[PDB]
Design an enzyme around this catalytic site. Structure first.
Site, short mmCIF file in Angstrom:
data_model
loop_
_atom_site.label_atom_id
_atom_site.label_comp_id
_atom_site.label_asym_id
_atom_site.label_seq_id
_atom_site.Cartn_x
_atom_site.Cartn_y
_atom_site.Cartn_z
N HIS A 186 1.06 -1.36 0.38
CA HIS A 186 0.04 0.33 -0.16
C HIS A 186 1.20 1.06 -0.50
CE1 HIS A 186 -3.79 -2.17 0.98
NE2 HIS A 186 -3.13 -2.62 1.60
N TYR A 200 -2.71 -2.74 -18.88
CA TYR A 200 -1.99 -3.70 -17.99
C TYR A 200 -2.30 -3.29 -16.38
CZ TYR A 200 0.44 -4.19 -22.80
OH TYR A 200 1.14 -3.99 -23.20
C1 LIG Z 1 -0.01 -5.16 4.93
C2 LIG Z 1 -0.93 -4.99 3.34
C3 LIG Z 1 -2.24 -5.67 3.91
O1 LIG Z 1 -2.87 -6.42 4.93
O2 LIG Z 1 -2.84 -4.94 2.62
C4 LIG Z 1 -2.56 -3.98 4.69
C5 LIG Z 1 -4.55 -4.18 5.14
C6 LIG Z 1 -4.68 -2.79 6.49
C7 LIG Z 1 -5.49 -2.03 5.95
C8 LIG Z 1 -5.90 -0.69 6.44
C9 LIG Z 1 -7.35 -0.67 6.66
N1 LIG Z 1 -7.43 0.87 7.30
C10 LIG Z 1 -8.63 1.85 8.13
O3 LIG Z 1 -9.61 0.79 7.02
C11 LIG Z 1 -8.95 2.80 8.11
C12 LIG Z 1 -9.32 4.10 7.10
C13 LIG Z 1 -9.98 4.29 8.20
N2 LIG Z 1 -9.91 3.25 9.42
C14 LIG Z 1 -9.07 3.86 11.08
C15 LIG Z 1 -8.51 3.27 11.26
C16 LIG Z 1 -8.75 2.44 12.03
C17 LIG Z 1 -6.89 2.19 13.22
C18 LIG Z 1 -5.66 1.06 12.92
O4 LIG Z 1 -6.19 -0.38 12.27
C19 LIG Z 1 -6.73 -1.08 12.71
C20 LIG Z 1 -6.61 -1.44 13.70
C21 LIG Z 1 -7.37 -2.66 14.97
C22 LIG Z 1 -8.08 -3.38 14.66
C23 LIG Z 1 -8.35 -3.09 12.42
C24 LIG Z 1 -7.69 -2.14 11.88
C25 LIG Z 1 -8.19 -2.02 10.58
C26 LIG Z 1 -8.46 -2.59 9.89
N3 LIG Z 1 -8.84 -2.29 8.44
C27 LIG Z 1 -7.66 -1.14 8.38
N4 LIG Z 1 -7.64 -0.59 9.52
CA LIG Z 2 0.91 -1.18 -15.62
ZN LIG Z 3 -3.84 -7.07 3.70
#
Ligand SMILES: CCC(O)(O)CCCCC[C@@H]1NC(=O)[C@H]2CCN2CCCCCOc2ccccc2-c2cnc1[nH]2
Ligand SMILES: [Ca+2]
Ligand SMILES: [Zn+2]
Ligand SMILES: [Ca+2]
Length: 368
Positions: free
Chosen positions: A135, A216
């Site tokens: 990301h 692509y």
């Molecule tokens: C390494 C590659 C990968 O696995 O693809 C990365 C995946 C990244 C997901 C980011 C996404 N982030 C969000 O939904 C953000 C946007 C609104 N929220 C606020 C942030 C919340 C706090 C930090 O996050 C978490 C903390 C605890 C439990 C779940 C989350 C969380 C779940 N989904 C999010 N955050």
């Molecule tokens: Ca491309």
């Molecule tokens: Zn992921």
């Protein structure tokens, strides 16, 4: 036949801590390593400790200001960087933690070193479970990712390979990688991900690239509950068609384990065998291959998944009974390597899967 596999790991990686409550646990990399060592998988692999990638190596993609910020910020001086933290998206998803920059350097170091080894034709496969942080953007951290080790590794492969294929099986769309190469035909990005009310919100099947990069970028949007049967039904035909039309000379495969059943953040229903079938499919094309980590938030399952995928890379059969290891208690109550899918409904009907595959095939017919 069997291939030479080079594996990148730094024993300090498991000590980096995102903070209480944060689902990203670098300790899962150490659990994977310990489990694969206890299965005897070190006997057939060349194990390397990656160098700490320099700020200069990182600026081959990221902006100088962003890398300077990452190299300077610490929990003790955060108060003086409130402005830059907002500008670079450092906060809840991407917190400031002790040793943040060194963690980025080790994650990146493994990916770039693996790409160099492949370029020199010194290995058939290079593995970096600490990488796959898809990301991260040119001047912005995102979704637990700060430095895009994948983009940097691809830029390295592009020094000796005209066309590079990137495949992402993490449950989240590989947006940073897609964005980096969106307007070029030298990289084809293929992402299979949950789409709809799900981070990062991108990866629509209508996002196919722009300018010289039109056709692509490939996106396969999925709904909750996809299983081994359904995933297997579309992965091989899509990858086979991409190989046929694009003819890449090197491949990077992001193996994010958050697409497994029971993941803390994911809502898919793949087993370790179903997930590893993707590695078997890609490996069959006999091209230089960089295998990377990524997501995975039920850490005992991440260790099982990446241990089994390392065995797949080595063409080594390993027993289902887990050998004793430093984290044995994390694998209870069964102490087995393979996992069972849940009873969750698969919202991806067979007709939906075929329809999306046919739309992707129409786009693939547009390549030269
Ligand atoms: C390494 C590659 C990968 O696995 O693809 C990365 C995946 C990244 C997901 C980011 C996404 N982030 C969000 O939904 C953000 C946007 C609104 N929220 C606020 C942030 C919340 C706090 C930090 O996050 C978490 C903390 C605890 C439990 C779940 C989350 C969380 C779940 N989904 C999010 N955050
Ligand atoms: Ca491309
Ligand atoms: Zn992921
Ligand atoms: Ca993906």
């Amino acid at each position: 036949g069997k291939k030479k596999v080079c594996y990148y790991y730094d024993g300090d990686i498991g000590n980096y801590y995102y903070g209480q409550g944060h689902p990203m646990k670098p300790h899962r990399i150490r659990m994977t390593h310990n489990l694969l060592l206890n299965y005897g998988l070190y006997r057939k692999m060349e194990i390397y400790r990656p160098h700490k990638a320099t700020a200069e190596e990182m600026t081959k993609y990221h902006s100088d200001e962003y890398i300077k910020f990452l190299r300077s910020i610490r929990p003790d001086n955060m108060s003086e960087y409130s402005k830059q933290m907002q500008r670079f998206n450092v906060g809840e998803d991407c917190p400031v933690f002790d040793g943040l920059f060194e963690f980025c350097q080790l994650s990146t170091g493994g990916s770039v070193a693996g790409a160099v080894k492949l370029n020199r034709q010194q290995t058939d496969m290079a593995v970096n479970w600490a990488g796959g942080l898809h990301h991260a953007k040119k001047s912005e951290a995102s979704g637990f990712c700060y430095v895009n080790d994948i983009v940097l590794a691809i830029l390295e492969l592009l020094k000796y390979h005209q066309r590079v294929l990137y495949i992402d099986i993490d449950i989240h769309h590989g947006d940073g990688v897609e964005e980096a190469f969106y307007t070029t035909d030298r990289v084809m990005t293929v992402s299979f991900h949950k789409y709809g009310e799900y981070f990062p919100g991108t990866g629509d099947l209508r996002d196919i690239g722009a300018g010289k990069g039109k056709y692509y970028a490939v996106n396969f949007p999925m709904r909750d509950g996809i299983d081994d049967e359904s995933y297997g039904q579309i992965f091989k035909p899509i990858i086979s068609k991409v190989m046929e039309m694009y003819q890449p000379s090197a491949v990077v495969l992001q193996c994010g384990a958050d697409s497994l059943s029971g993941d803390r953040l994911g809502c898919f229903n793949l087993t370790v065998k179903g997930h590893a079938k993707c590695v078997e499919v890609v490996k069959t094309f006999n091209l230089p291959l960089l295998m990377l980590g990524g997501g995975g938030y039920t850490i005992r399952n991440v260790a099982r998944c990446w241990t089994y995928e390392t065995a797949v890379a080595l063409d080594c059969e390993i027993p289902n009974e887990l050998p004793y290891n430093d984290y044995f208690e994390y694998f209870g109550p069964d102490f087995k390597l393979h996992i069972s899918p849940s009873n969750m409904t698969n919202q991806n009907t067979p007709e939906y899967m075929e329809k999306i595959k046919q739309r992707l095939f129409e786009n693939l017919r547009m390549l030269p």
